[PDB]
A paper describes a structure:
We directed our attention to the DNAJA2ΔG/FR mutant because a preliminary inspection of these oligomers suggested them to be less flexible, possibly due to a lack of the disordered G/FR. A preliminary 3D reconstruction without imposing symmetry yielded 9.2 Å resolution and revealed the same general features observed for DNAJA2wt: an oligomeric structure in which the dimers associate in longitudinal filaments interacting laterally (~100 Å separation) to form a helical arrangement with ~32 Å pitch. The helical structure could also be visualised as disks of five DNAJA2ΔG/FR dimers, separated by ~76 Å. We finally imposed D5 symmetry in the longitudinal axis, which generated a better 3D reconstruction of 6.9 Å resolution. A clear picture emerged again of the arrangement of dimeric DNAJA2 within the oligomer: the DD is placed in the outer part of the structure, followed by the main body of the monomer (the CTDI, containing the ZFLR, and the CTDII), and at the core of the helical tube, with a very flexible arrangement, the JD. Docking was excellent with regard to the DD, CTDI and CTDII domains, whereas some movements were required to fit the ZFLR into the central cylinder of the tubular structure. Docking analysis revealed that, as expected from the disordered nature of its amino acid sequence, the CD located downstream from the DD is not visible. Despite the clear role of JD in DNAJA2 oligomerisation, no mass in the 3D reconstruction could be attributed to this domain. The linker (13 residues) that connects the JD to the main body of the cochaperone in DNAJA2ΔG/FR is flexible enough to average out the JD during the 3D reconstruction process. The first seems to be related to the longitudinal interaction of DNAJA2 dimers that could lead to filament formation. It is located in the core region of the CTDI implicated in substrate interaction, and involves residues L135Q136 of monomers in adjacent dimers within the same filament (red circles in Fig. 4b).
Residue numbers in the entry:
A (entry chain C), D (entry chain G): 43 to 284
B (entry chain P): 95 to 177
C (entry chain B): 43 to 177
Write the structure that this text describes.
Amino acid sequence: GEDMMHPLKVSLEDLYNGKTTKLQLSKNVLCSACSGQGGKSGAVQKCSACRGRGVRIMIRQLAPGMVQQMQSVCSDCNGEGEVINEKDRCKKCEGKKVIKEVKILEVHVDKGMKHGQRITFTGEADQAPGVEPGDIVLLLQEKEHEVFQRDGNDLHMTYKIGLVEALCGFQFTFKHLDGRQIVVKYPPGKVIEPGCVRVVRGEGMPQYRNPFEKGDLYIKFDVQFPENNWINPDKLSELEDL
Amino acid sequence: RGVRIMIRQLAPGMVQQMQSVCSDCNGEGEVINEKDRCKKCEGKKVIKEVKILEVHVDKGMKHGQRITFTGEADQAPGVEPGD
Amino acid sequence: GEDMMHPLKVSLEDLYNGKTTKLQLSKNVLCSACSGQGGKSGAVQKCSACRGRGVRIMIRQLAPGMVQQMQSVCSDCNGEGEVINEKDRCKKCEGKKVIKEVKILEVHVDKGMKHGQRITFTGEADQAPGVEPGD
Amino acid sequence: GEDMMHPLKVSLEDLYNGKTTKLQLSKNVLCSACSGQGGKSGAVQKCSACRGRGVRIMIRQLAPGMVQQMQSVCSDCNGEGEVINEKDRCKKCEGKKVIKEVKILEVHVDKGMKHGQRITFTGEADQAPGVEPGDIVLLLQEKEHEVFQRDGNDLHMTYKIGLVEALCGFQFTFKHLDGRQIVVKYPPGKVIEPGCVRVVRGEGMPQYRNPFEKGDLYIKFDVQFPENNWINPDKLSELEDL
Ligand SMILES: [Zn+2]
Ligand SMILES: [Zn+2]
Ligand SMILES: [Zn+2]
Ligand SMILES: [Zn+2]
Ligand SMILES: [Zn+2]
Ligand SMILES: [Zn+2]
């Protein structure tokens, strides 16, 4: 049978911490009451309606002397070309050989898993009579995150700082993907240039299969200048001297 | 026949037969070479002409009163014109 | 369209406290690339294979002088009776007029709800061309 | 005849001020001594060497039993297939019907002309017997300029300023494409943000055919922060208060 592909939307926190989620899927299963045979041997009859074709040709007049032949799925066998009396299949499928069942799959998203990574559930796809079921393949879709951008195992963020912080040193705090508060300290007497990047080592994403190893966090600094007229002209001399 | 049956597919396995007036004889069922009729009608046996009728409305005429111009309607081959 | 019925298994604690749960369902949606038309007007062709029937009659010999005629869904149009070139529909449906999409429904189970109670999501069932979706 | 295309490399100053330049080109002209006839009527003889083919097949042995046939241009008629005795053409062409002459073209580059603009000299290409000459087409190629980048009729430049200049106002001078010194003044109490753009109106490129109208000059400001440790920590408080 055909494999079923489903996108699983995951956050950066889900990918960092790991996540177990329950996915509800509706799939075709072989009808438990007739084991797909549709019905008993000799219960399966040619649909009289479409004469086994699955489809009926309906004639719609558009104008006198203009008829449109439309092919419609046959109402009496729903396209199957066969009819099975309810008593021979069950009061479930309806000569269809399958029933829609709701299955809950438990999905494990491991630490450090990547965008586009596949989680396969073997033989979990749609069942059909005389067909071995395909797989359900979940495709991991990473959601955009407001603070962090992921590059492989590394994380990138933009942090806004004032001119005073950029020149005189600073301390700031942010929330990481595990919910820890990280305190970043930059010593006085070192300058942060506008757009410059600094690194916080080991505060990136965990490696897949090796969650003890992590990438790095790169912080791009956006240096905010003070507004128009922030200082009296008389004090510009004192600033120049410094 | 004057008409052609054109088949329009609506979907694979749904065909609509539409009757269209035949492009080649404009519904007449016959064709006359231009040289045999003229460069006017076109095997049509008639031409559209613009006629000016002078209409006299007499004093005291009533709403719904009829003014008839005899034989002034459309001409057709082998047909005496209406009014 | 037909309504889709799904059993939602709930515990007594879920029914007592109330519960919000996310249900992932796969449904047929109209193909965004051809708006169900399947393809452009005149892109829809009769399947040559089954001559518009959706099905092919395959002859299986059981023994010399015993042939079984089996009706199989036509491989070339997957039962539709029509074929649409990929370029006329998209590289998605495949002349099918629909695509399987995964939708997440947020389901609210209120306090005191009963066994057999129905929660309806209107128009959320399978879409088909020229058919208003069921619930 | 075929048109001759020549790239003319022009600077922004050339395009702003206008430029007259002399271009020396070598072209084929009809031989003044035989008027292309090659020679007198009956002076033109089939080349005996190549029997009128212009080419000779030379056999080079590569190994015994391996011969390479190479087609070479015929030495005796230089590919023409004909030979004209020197006395019948002149001591110039040599039965060639043309001579290489050096022509100087005066090229006018007007104010506001654009990259890729064509200057055509009609009938100035190579002459051949019984062929009307093609044109010489000069294609203007704008050279990169160290300070200014041109966009249509507008000019762009990057100007570096200190943090003090960005906050307290500044005055600077630059040399324009006409060689004028432009003094740009920015008033005190207005801030220049890093990477912000300002405009000096009417200091762009002149419009082609309308050199009284000019585009604008856009100045991107690159704000230079002071280096690491530029101020004593004790003075950081005084800076914060301002
Ligand atoms: Zn069944
Ligand atoms: Zn049927
Ligand atoms: Zn489609
Ligand atoms: Zn088919
Ligand atoms: Zn000569
Ligand atoms: Zn020769």
